Design a protein around this ligand. Structure first.
Ligand SMILES: Cc1ccc2c(c1)ncn2[C@H]1O[C@H](COP(=O)(O)O)[C@@H](O)[C@H]1O
Ligand SMILES: Cc1ccc2c(c1)ncn2[C@H]1O[C@H](COP(=O)(O)O)[C@@H](O)[C@H]1O
Ligand SMILES: O=C(O)c1cccnc1
Ligand SMILES: O=C(O)c1cccnc1
Lengths: 346, 346
């Protein structure tokens, strides 16, 4: 793991410079394609991309797990929904599934800790049958967190070996917006009230309770904000850890990762805390409708491309943004050049 | 024309109600897909869509024309660029071309008034060799504006006959951000300084001049804000008129139109002024980096989905948003249902 972290490559400034120059020469006023140009340059700097903005195969990794904190009354979805939805993931009837197929991405469902019998067709990496209830103690042990980071990290990079060049992250886990808010609070130093949202339709009345649980989780565990692994283990969840692991793996592999929503922002904060070298590989997708979204994004210094008021999770926003990434590549490779038309601008 | 306007269909509330109910029953927390759900409902209300969110063939209509106001020093691109770029449109090397191909849309290049010899391969609807210089008089005659609206309107609806279900609008015309700012100022009652931008890289120093030209155009022509046709004819351009005409045609045809950037917002304001019934058919794409974008969008009461800091025009933003529209359809038609999984939420 320390190895893993040590070996994350820096971005290739040389490739980026060449990309910039090429973009500037395209059939358009310079800088006119805005963020699409910036994105293209970003991709070019990623070592696993072979010095150019390109997209081969696409995959969305969905990390599923249950949380003990569900017992605190923080979620209206029945616990079993995690197991059910996970199975549905295998049938392609879920939101991410439909969106991924639309983008031509393949969905990978990974069980990192669902509290139910194993689901056939789902990749098994189960840590335990749900994590500990963060309201009264830690979600898991440091060892447990580290091992999972390791395992997921490797799975991720292994996919790269098989042609995958673009990843998307997602999750599934009733009550998961609770540990997510906890992490956000800790990493950003914001008060719980500021970052706790309605998650999956939590009734406005039930909010106060959710805010109390978060505070309690923090007070009780005393997570160290300067130690991402500490935070994940104490007030996180298996799903959140899995997401952070995809991020670490893609970065080590020198490949891009599309973030999703609120849950993903949490994981991103952790990953960047653990390894700042991870940052350059991350790509925002959409602006989650979760209350704590703005605070979380500010801390990540990210401005998502999509404003859809989405709040489903599963990696749905990530799938939705994939065509944007492909568009930046298309721009890069298929547009004509000013010079060739004898067009001269100032 | 009055006929045309008279016959624009109202949206089908019945279809919309059925769509809403269907969406609510999908495998997800209700309302969780946010704007994607709203979009799907919007599409269902469009009569040419056959009571369901669906996308068949896609087309982007690009209206090209030159402007006399170019002579006022408001644009850094050489005048000939319009003619050149238009030809390039026929070769698929332009920004819209590349993006449209990515979305599987076909680009239609229409010459409504380029000041050059006719370009083979380009649809000919030329009004004149460039419009009048709005700084000293009107761009064209009312008759001229009306006829063009008519002609474009018809072309648009005719495409519908051939399978097109989704349109995108775009333009090409050096100096066009000038008449656009003029229209915006007039329709919204905002001062010129507030809505005049750098267009295609106009140097910050040269701005004042551009602001003066706009004021002059207005003072001199005295366009009537309550009369969209009056405004278009006086301080608009052939390209802007063409765009408004696509909007009127698609609406009459009961089909959706994706807006583009700043130029398109101008045209949208005019169309909505001319016929409010047009509104429900319009769909924002991206948030243009042009200074007057915010004011224009507010008046249209629209919140674009994409924040890409784009400012190229040509219908590039429109092409970029097409996959979003298709995504809403996919959601609608391919997701599974809560009931079927025995999932019960509150
Ligand atoms: C039927 C259903 C319900 C929720 C779902 C879902 C499908 N897909 C994602 N989520 C989202 O809701 C949960 C987080 O919200 P809270 O913390 O309020 O539970 C996670 O499962 C998240 O993926
Ligand atoms: C090479 C080139 C230049 C401009 C272009 C373009 C390609 N494609 C679109 N535009 C954009 O720039 C023009 C409006 O900006 P202004 O009012 O400053 O001229 C229009 O042609 C608009 O389509
Ligand atoms: O932003 C998300 O991804 C999200 C928000 C609420 C509930 N589930 C997921
Ligand atoms: O927003 C646009 O479409 C735009 C802005 C500047 C120059 N051309 C087009």
């Amino acid at each position: 793991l320390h190895a893993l972290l040590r070996d994350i490559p820096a971005p290739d400034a040389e490739a980026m410079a060449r990309t910039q120059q090429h973009i500037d020469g395209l059939l358009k006023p310079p800088g006119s394609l805005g963020r699409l140009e910036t994105l293209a340059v970003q991709l070019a700097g990623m070592p696993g991309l072979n010095g150019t903005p390109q997209v081969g195969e696409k995959a969305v990794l969905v990390m599923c797990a249950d949380h003990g904190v569900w017992d605190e009354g923080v979620a209206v979805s029945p616990k079993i929904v995690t197991a059910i939805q996970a199975a549905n993931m295998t049938r392609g009837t879920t939101g991410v599934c439909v969106l991924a197929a639309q983008a031509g991405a393949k969905v990978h469902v990974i069980d990192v800790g669902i509290d139910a019998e194993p689901i056939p067709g789902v990749v098994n990496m189960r840590v335990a049958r749900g994590c500990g209830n963060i309201a009264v103690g830690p979600a898991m042990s440091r060892l447990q967190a580290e091992a999972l980071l390791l395992e997921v990290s490797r799975y991720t990079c292994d996919l790269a070996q098989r042609g995958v060049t673009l990843f998307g992250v997602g999750e599934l886990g009733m009550a998961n917006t609770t540990p997510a808010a906890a992490m956000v609070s800790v990493f950003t130093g914001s008060d719980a009230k500021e970052v706790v949202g309605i998650g999956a339709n939590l009734p406005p009345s039930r909010i106060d309770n959710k805010v109390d649980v978060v505070r309690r989780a923090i007070a009780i565990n005393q997570p160290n904000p300067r130690d991402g692994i500490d935070v994940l283990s104490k007030v996180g969840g298996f799903d959140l850890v899995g997401m952070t692991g995809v991020m670490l793996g893609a970065a080590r592999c020198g490949l891009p990762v599309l973030l999703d929503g609120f849950l993903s922002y949490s994981a991103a904060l952790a990953a960047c805390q653990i390894a700042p070298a991870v940052r350059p590989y991350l790509i925002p997708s959409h602006f989650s409708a979760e209350k704590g979204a703005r605070i979380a994004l500010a801390h990540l210094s990210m401005e998502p491309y999509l404003h859809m008021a989405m709040r489903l999770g599963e990696g749905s926003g990530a799938a939705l943004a994939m065509p944007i990434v492909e568009a930046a590549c298309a721009m890069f490779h298929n547009m004509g050049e000013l010079a060739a038309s004898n067009i001269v601008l100032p």
